[PDB]
Design a protein around this ligand. Structure first.
Ligand code: CL
Ligand code: MG
Lengths: 265, 271, 266, 272, 263
């Protein structure tokens, strides 16, 4: 829709945005115990009685950042991002109150199992597609979650009638919303999933890696209304309590985004 | 062999095709429960009584897309659409972040439900004609007759546990060709690019990625992409991400959809 | 061979396309269990280690006759190869008569465990070195296998007195023959092994990868007597029967080899 | 903050710093048994009674190295600083893990190998022109560090520290004192440090390690500028956990290895 | 050594080809258990940790005499190296523990992998570092170990060094490359641990490893000697009763050298 023209050169043609997003694993109140974890996971008796408890399901983190006001028009173009998962070293901890190895003599189980890492940087809200492992999942224990008002069998595949935009932090469940690959022309997203039961988390952290956000035409996300949208989720595994009760553990993500002025029609 | 000449230049010389294919794990009716999963897996008592139930077998997804028409067949040259590149992603990976479904669970019924896990199989193909298939099976005696909508050879022979070039097909129907007995024919498919991976074992962690930033070049070593015969683009895939483990241990394949964004350009060829 | 200039122009290039079926031990395409070994057995002791007939994988190999060409002569020079394992999707099968997960309610065990993948392209037979995990292994249950006529302790390491050439399909056991790194000047070989008991097979297939066969001097394998030699082995794991009996499973390999005419001195 | 100008050329415009850092797994006294290991790991009865024993928790290794002294003044138009260009770093003693006869739990009904050191791996190093800047973040905000008053931890605890609370920061200024479990590199700072880290978790996971003397890590940033050494100090930090030793009765200790560094530095003119 | 120009022309190049057999503990090609260690034993306590004779792997090493030659020295430019006999691990019928209630495959050789090689113009320089400072090596007086033991050797104590001057004698468990020296050697190593871990191995004759440093200079062969060192552990053989032995494989080397003028 936007006809892109030349870069604006010279002084004040560049700016940087720095932020972090804290994890939204389910206990999302920084004043309460278990912050940065989910509530204890529960398991449906049957697929038609699959009703997660309030706070046991991870959601996307997201923010809109206001950019410096500008005026053809000029827009901020996101060129690149340096992003890191924060607190990886916190997983070097095997003395927490957990199940333990070797007949109660060995280490406590570290946080381990399923990893899920995604981030997105764009010039408008991340566009979502609904897709679930169980179309019958009942989200009514927590009315602050944003989910479709109707359920249908077809949502176990891609039904393009079920879409959304990621416009609220800590509200859109990761289990039923993914990036919409048919849209997001003005957003870059990257994600990975490593599953299984007790799988080793495999994580890296460095301040030396720059991710280029320019597309194949050399154009980055263009920030509509001078808003920059950043979204993520970083699940690093489960904490296994003494009795076998399990909670998701998430970590924060840091972003340093470089933007430049771009003339558009 | 098509003799390739120059690229056609100018504003109308490029087009893009966008589509998705839903998974064909065995329950392939979007109006019914268990859509995007297989029916429960069953296990043969013996190799001569190996008869999968209807709906327990994954099949390839496929579509033919009609491209913009390009009419003179009496000239020295013709124009064809050439597929240059594709951006393709597995959709709904985040749906696997779910451990509260009605499943077997960890740690003496106190821990998480088992996530979808185990065997992964991922393949896609983009070509200017149907994907050409070779028959090869783990069990030549497999009996597919519980589901007469599957496309399989009418005769069975011991040699089909290896490569018998008398047993070939083309992928011409969505949700009908079992992945277990049909693979890409490497002796053909000159006008298709295919990429596949398999990670097996029992409860193996799925390892998946999704991004809208990766472009797969479809040009061959001579700089020529698939040429779309009869202005048809053929897209095929399969994306198994593991098994759902029910409370009693019963298991079903789980598949995910795949998205494709294909860039094509006009190419002059000799007629 | 003293190598001279490339021959240019029309008909200076040719391609050879073939497949090799796996030689896991049941190597008769008319019989049940083709593409698998016979059931694996285990030695009572290292001094009585006698594999049953058909339980041991062997190399696949072929010599392909090239177009006749022939002071100087012309030889075919192998430039590159596109090679793929065929039938990987056949491993998406968990309903065969196998051991199964979760108290006989879950999937059948897929083919899983040890993987071994190697291919070689050369202008003469692949040169082999003998090396075994057990110098005492007794191969006499199958007199069609090619093994050294005498055994010695030292063959658990590299004893250069024990060599061979891969001249017969389905006959040289992989367990005791490997490529001889001190020879094979006119062959390129590539291999990998992933072991363990029930290890996930990790496999790829594509028609988009070209392997260059030219050496560091820009010279490919030169085909002596207009013969191209192709060898491989592709073990993708074990099939686990209901009672725990196991068989190797192998898959075929496809090859598309590009060759060019090269002038050499006679 | 520092405006970088041209490289200084000529004699003594280059210098190299070579050092090693020994691991700080918890038994950090080279004269005592169990050096290079933690004390035995213990497990909290509950999250509000989570008090690691003295010596059971790994800390960062760190040193400040004096560089050849340069002029510092407020009057001169330019100054010279040392710029770290590159580092060659390796984990030392990887082959020490080829040992399965130590007094450990063993495989196959007491007939097989002793368990090798295995499990959790954590590897990080940093090279900078000032102390590594740390962010506090913990798996348990209530962790009680009072069994060892030599550890540097925040004096106040709060629920928010299970995420990123930017009010809780520090600088890595003491060897063997900052727990890895609650301090990580602060990504919002460290403009003048390069750091690299990895974690591989799980219970008995195979350690996967490499060692070579052939790899040079470039420390220049995207603008071609390396860490600039304030007060002619070079700061080197690391941690290298290679797993756990499993005693006969199942008691477990962290095992760490030393890290070697060879850092090349050059003189850089900066605006004063 | 002040390095000057390359010598050009015919006979300015030579190649050295060799293999080294593994030194897993039984190192005599005429005797039982060749190419394996003796059975692994386990210390009752850390102060009674005394490996049996032959149960511990050592480095393989050789010094190769080069053609006799300001002065001229041989400079090692590159090496092609491969582990030999990888296919020997495709064997599950040996007398071993077996899967599935005595019906399944014999356990393949599996577990710990350790692979290192070094090429240099002088002996590989070693640093002592051990998991247990008290380890008692006196069951085998042919091993080269320090004469004194000290607590500090569980870390890096630079007072404990050596040079790899004898094949089949320096235990891998207590000697590693000294990163503070070895300016005239290139070394590469990896370790994959755990209990029953799958060996992951490759072999090809198509890979050349460049030995030149960042200044374009390869190892310079002092006294016309080329030093080659390695170790290649591919796992453990698990006997019927659970007794385990290290298994090693040989390594092949093809080294290209060129004449270099030096002051
Ligand atoms: Cl100065
Ligand atoms: Mg040095």
């Amino acid at each position: 829709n936007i006809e892109v023209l030349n870069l604006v050169t010279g002084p004040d043609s560049i700016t940087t945005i720095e932020l972090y997003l804290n994890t939204r694993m389910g206990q999302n109140d920084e004043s309460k115990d278990n912050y940065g974890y989910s509530e204890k996971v529960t398991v449906a008796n049957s697929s038609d009685q699959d009703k997660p408890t309030s706070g046991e399901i991870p959601t996307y983190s997201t923010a809109r950042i206001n950019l410096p006001m500008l005026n053809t028009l000029t827009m901020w173009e996101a060129v690149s991002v340096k992003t890191e998962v924060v607190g990886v070293s916190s997983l070097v901890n095997v003395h927490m109150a957990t199940k333990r190895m070797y007949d109660d003599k060995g280490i406590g189980f570290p946080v381990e199992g399923m990893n899920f890492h995604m981030f997105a940087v764009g010039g408008e809200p991340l566009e979502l597609q609904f897709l679930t492992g169980n179309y019958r999942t009942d989200y009514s224990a927590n009315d602050k979650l944003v989910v479709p008002p109707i359920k249908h069998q077809s949502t176990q595949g891609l039904n393009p009638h079920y879409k959304q935009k990621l416009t609220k932090d800590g509200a859109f469940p990761v289990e039923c919303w993914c990036p919409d690959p048919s849209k997001n022309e003005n957003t870059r997203y990257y994600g990975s999933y490593t599953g299984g039961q007790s799988t080793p988390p495999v994580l890296q952290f460095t301040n030396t890696v720059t991710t280029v956000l320019l597309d194949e035409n050399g154009v980055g996300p263009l920030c509509k209304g001078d808003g920059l949208y950043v979204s993520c989720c970083d699940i690093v595994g489960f904490l296994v309590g003494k009795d076998g009760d399990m909670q998701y553990r998430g970590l924060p993500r840091y972003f340093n985004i470089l933007l430049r002025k771009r003339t558009v029609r």
